[model samples]
Structure formats: structure tokens, C-alpha cells
Target: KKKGSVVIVGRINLSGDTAYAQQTRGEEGCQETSQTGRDKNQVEGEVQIVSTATQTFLATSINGVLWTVYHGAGTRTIASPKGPVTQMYTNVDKDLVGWQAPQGSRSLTPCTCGSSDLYLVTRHADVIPVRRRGDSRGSLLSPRPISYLKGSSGGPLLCPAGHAVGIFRAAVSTRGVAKAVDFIPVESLETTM
Candidate 1:
């Protein structure tokens, strides 16, 4: 399941740079693809993140059978497998998108719910065990000292078996700690897919 992990991304206009949803591909060379959730905020923000630096500095989806993030249509957001550059991609809804992968790219497998012994796949592709303290709709907080849980958004919340249980979303300091990671259960996205 870890090998199939996928994440979203976006292109920065002026700098000509791309920001992974996590600040976050590969393939059978295009025969296979990876899809994941696209954070709505990443593309339609009221501020400069989308308004200025991301003013539709457009690009197009190369073709089908492509990775989702590399180029999801209708939005500046792209689905990237974290480290693919010139990768192929597409997106339909703010809820879903994907692209073709070359090699070492993993598609996130949607799951129903999570069990014990869960983990989070970090933006750096690092996996760490984690515990959440609320209901199915609640959130989790990244470790306080790891030094890199800084909100790349859309990282995967994986179960012990590496299956994706949720799509990592917002984060907060809460004025008392480092970061409180907020995520959407797969039910909110994939289950809807």
C-alpha cells in the first residue's frame, strides 16, 4: 500500500515552481496512474496563493492514463506522486484527480475505515505511527519534535498495512503546541468517489 501512495500538488506561477499538496509519480510509463484528493483551498483561496502567484499560469493534461496530480483540469492544482516533475496527470473534481506514473509511484488505495497500529505517510515519504483522539471525523496532531510536519496538506493517514484511511488536511499550533493535523476521512472523498 505504501508503494501505491499518491498525493496532490500545484504549480506556482511566478517562480515557475510546483507545490505539492503536502508541499507534497511513476508508471508502467502511463499505463498505470495514481489518484488522490485535491484540497479545494489550494486552488480557490481568496488570497495570493491562488489570486496572484497562481493566476492561471496554465498548463494542460497531456492525456489519459496519466497521474492525477501532475495535471488535474479545471484547477491550477495537480496530482503529483511527491517527486515526479514532468509527470502526466488530470483532475475532474476538487474531490478527485490523478496522473500517469513512471516508476516508484504509488496510487493511494481508498479504504473504508481504520484499525489500530496506524501511521501517517509524511510529505517526505517518511512513515510514522500515530494516534488520533476523537471520533471518525476528528483529527490527529503530528509529533512535536520531528521538525517537518509543517502542513504540506493531503499526506496520507495510513493504517498499519499501509492502506490510506484518510487524506491529511489542515494543521494548527492551537497556541499551545506545534501542530494539530486535520484530515478528511476517506469517506468524505474516496467513498464519495
Candidate 2:
């Protein structure tokens, strides 16, 4: 799972379970991840699924644990390649849950703040920058220049230093024109986790 400096994109189900499809027809051996199961254009491969807390939206699993909602079922399995998944911990008060990353897995260090130039890594792992678009606010309502594509949700907004400043959440379409993109501030990861 050589993710490099890129964030692993996957689909989140209504039940809060997330699934990542295996590699199929590419050098990277993978396909674009679908956040919803009902996708006309879906990835083709065996899928690794992870169940999260009910109503779960954002999640992180590091140090061999999946962290999402701290409460609810408080436990779930991550269909990892290494085989045999396990539940780690969940603290509702802290709003965090955990499981485990698969063998040969790695993680990225989220950028803590804004910078002069940032790049949006698409689901295709293409690094594109916002060169001319005007500044706008993201989901967190903070002013920033973010870009995205159809399956770019949950991707990372990386700084020049290779750190993530935000997580792409949605694209802002106005009058049939996608004017801007919305992202969840990376700071939330610090404050929440």
C-alpha cells in the first residue's frame, strides 16, 4: 500500500462504513474511490470495508486503530489485507474511534495551517494547484483556495512542504459553474483528536 504522500480516498456508506477497492487496471493498480455505493461509474476490484460509527462522516485510523465517533457501536472491523481485524477504542466524549491500519500501511501528516501555494491531489493522484481562482471559504467557513473533482472528496489539500492543510469535502457549484471547493480544516484534526 505505497500511498506515498497522498491521502487514501474511499467511499463512506450511509451506515458510516467505508470501503476501499483493490487495484485493478493501472500502474498504481487501483481505481477512483466512490463515497457512495450506488455509483454508475464504480471501481472494479475486491473491496476492503471498514464499519464506522453510525452517522460517521470523517474518520482516521492510525497506530493500528480506526478513529471516528467515540460512541455508538464503538467498534467495527476493517477488512484489511493482513487478515483478522480488531476493534481498538472509542471515546464519545473525545469524539474519536479506532481500529487498525493494514500491514505495510502508512499515513500522512496533515498540514496545520495555510500557505502561499497548496496543491489538490485528485483521486487519480494528480496534483493540481489553484493558480487563478479567487480565495474562498471551505466547509469550515475559512478563507482558502481549494480545488477538486467529482471523486476528489476526502483528498488532502497539501502545502508546498508536503503537509495537508485541509481535507477536500465538496465542490461549490454556482449557476452550473463550480466556483470553489469546500474542505474541512486540518486544524480540526488537532482540536478533535
Candidate 3:
């Protein structure tokens, strides 16, 4: 077991950096590729973490691989989607490090629910979506009724089809009003991998 919070960076499009629903590599070692192919490393379903950081909840796995962000620190323990224990391998970088979970540990099947209603299992094991409504910010905002839970950091934001569309990062609350929960788009999550 490890400790600390993993910061999840919500994919924002202040400039032109928008998150894609899917990106597939046309060839090996290609920085960017065609969407004709789906990523072989993408994982669907919930994953637990022991990390801490600023708005950090973007740590996600496609094919069960997870990575840290620019400001993430402290030890992290990668677990199976269904709750069995697992480990992660670290590769250090100048401003960040990446962790890859064991292969073939995905507890759920990957699907294409698109930008429809989504769901998440809370730390209390309750399934629900964010109850309140707020302004839309393109793909960055919840297209469905996604709820926010305290202990659900780093959990996968699932579509009604039970496939992941994003990873739950944080719950944005202001003046007692939760604007919307933050999520690291699956496309952004792949860019780091």
C-alpha cells in the first residue's frame, strides 16, 4: 500500500488544446496519429489511488496503465478495477513521472457510450451522478448527471454503456454550489502515456 494524493488536471481548452474521444497510433513512436485506430492501452472502469496534489484526479489507465502529472507527489498504489491489489512501475521525467499498471487487469469492458449519460461508484459504493446542473464547457463539462464524491478521486467517469469517457478528478464548489466535477478527458490522459 502507498500514500498521498494524485493531482488530476481537468482538460481545459483555454487555447486550442481540446481532448479527443479517441486517438489511435498509425505507427509506432508516432507523437500523434489517426483516430481510425483505437488505443490498445485504454482501460475502462474505476481505479483507486493514494495521492495528493492540486486539482489532481486525471491519473487514468488505458489498458490499465497510469501516470502522474506535473505536480503530483507521494507514493501511489495501483489496484485492479474490481479491488484486487496491484503494483505500478515508475519512469522518471524532468517535470513528471509515469506509472503503468499490470496488463489485463481491467475489470470492465471498454465501450463507446459517446457523450451520453455517465455514472460512477462512490467511495461508499453508491452509484450516482452529480445531482446539480451547471453551464456547459464543451467536452470539459459533464454531458450527463455525474456526481462528485470525496473519496472517488482518480475514479473513472463511466458512460451508461459502462465504458469510461473520463476520469473523475475533483469537485468544484463555490459559495456552497458545486459548479461541476472535474475530469481528465481520456484523450488528455493518453497524451501523457
Candidate 4:
């Protein structure tokens, strides 16, 4: 859960449902929300999953959105929960590690003007530290602004080389921190709801 700003990228899907209904994670501990399913905007990216018995490539995308070459297909949104995010070096410590400061990722899509960019802030959470702050815990700051790829939510972050990392989901912005209460990973969407 990197504390930074993010955007989304993807293709466009106007024919089918442009929005998806999803079950949110938590509401009990939230003030602006409750436990219930909600509607989400639909975008485009690509996805690939392997068969348990056979190996194959699955490529697909949402229609009518920007395309970030690095992001997968789905609706990915990026927001700056900690207020406005900028390139200011003073705001963030430079030596931050991904594990220590926490981090966020997003999807990308081709824009109307023919460019890959992120349009929304999809997920927000603290990247848990694998180990505690040791005695020599010096400055490990964010290297760059947290970014999101378009069409990454509810899907995999499939890179061009065909390697898939983790999944993504929508997040919440309130107060000074962005909360990643629910995560919509790609692998989980292949089953019936």
C-alpha cells in the first residue's frame, strides 16, 4: 500500500455492460459505507490464465478507455488519498522500500488521442513490511508516484512478456489515508458469482 497517486488505463467496451456489480469487502468498520454490493464502471485490458490440465493464453479487454501498455484488462482507478500527489521530493522520504512504505499498482489503456494512460485510482493499501524496523532503519522513501494501470481491477497485472504478478481492486478515499478494504484479484473472477 504505497501512499501515492494513481491512474488507470484500458480499452473500451460499450456494447456489453459498461459496469459491473461487485460485492464490497467491509462496511462494519466504515462510516461512509455499508456491507453491500455496488456497481462499478467497466473498461478494457487483457487477461491470460492457464488451464490446470493444459496451458494456453487468454487475451481480452474492455472497450472505450485508454490503454496503458503495461496494465491488464478491467477497470482500474487511481486516486491520491493522502491529498494531492506530486513530484515534490520533500513530501516523501527517498530511501523508502516497497515492503516498508507499502505500495500500490494500476493498469493502463490507450487514450482517445492514441496514448497509453491510467484514468482512475483502483486500489489503495499499505504494503505490509516483511520484517520490523531494525535499529538502522533509515530513510526508505517512495521512489515514484504510485500508479495504476487501466483495466487492472478484478484481473491480473499481465506484462508483455506473459508474466503475471498480482491482482487489483477498487479502493476508498477518506480523510488523509486511502483504504484498501476490498481487493478484486483477477484469478477470482473466473468462477460463478
Per-residue CA lDDT of candidate 3, range 1-193, in tens? 2232232212211112332222211223121111111123333322433223223333444556653333343344333223323234333332233455535334333444455465554443445554323221113233333343555555566666666555555566666544566655555544554
Compared with the true structure, what per-residue lDDT tens digits does model 1 show for residues 17-88? 432221111122211322232222222210011111221111211111222222213233333334323323
- C-alpha displacement of 140 in model 2, angstroms? 17
- Model 3: residue 48 alpha-carbon error in angstroms: 2.6
| lDDT of the candidates, in the order given | 0.36, 0.40, 0.40, 0.23
Score every model by TM-score: 0.45, 0.48, 0.47, 0.21
What residue runs in model 2 are displaced by over 4 Å at the alpha carbon? Answer: 1-77, 82-99, 131-148
- Sorted by TM-score (best first), the order is 2, 3, 1, 4
Q: How close is candidate 1 to the true structure, as a TM-score?
A: 0.45
The TM-score leader among the candidates is 2
In candidate 3, residue 6 scores what lDDT?
A: 35
- Give candidate 3's whole-model lDDT: 0.40
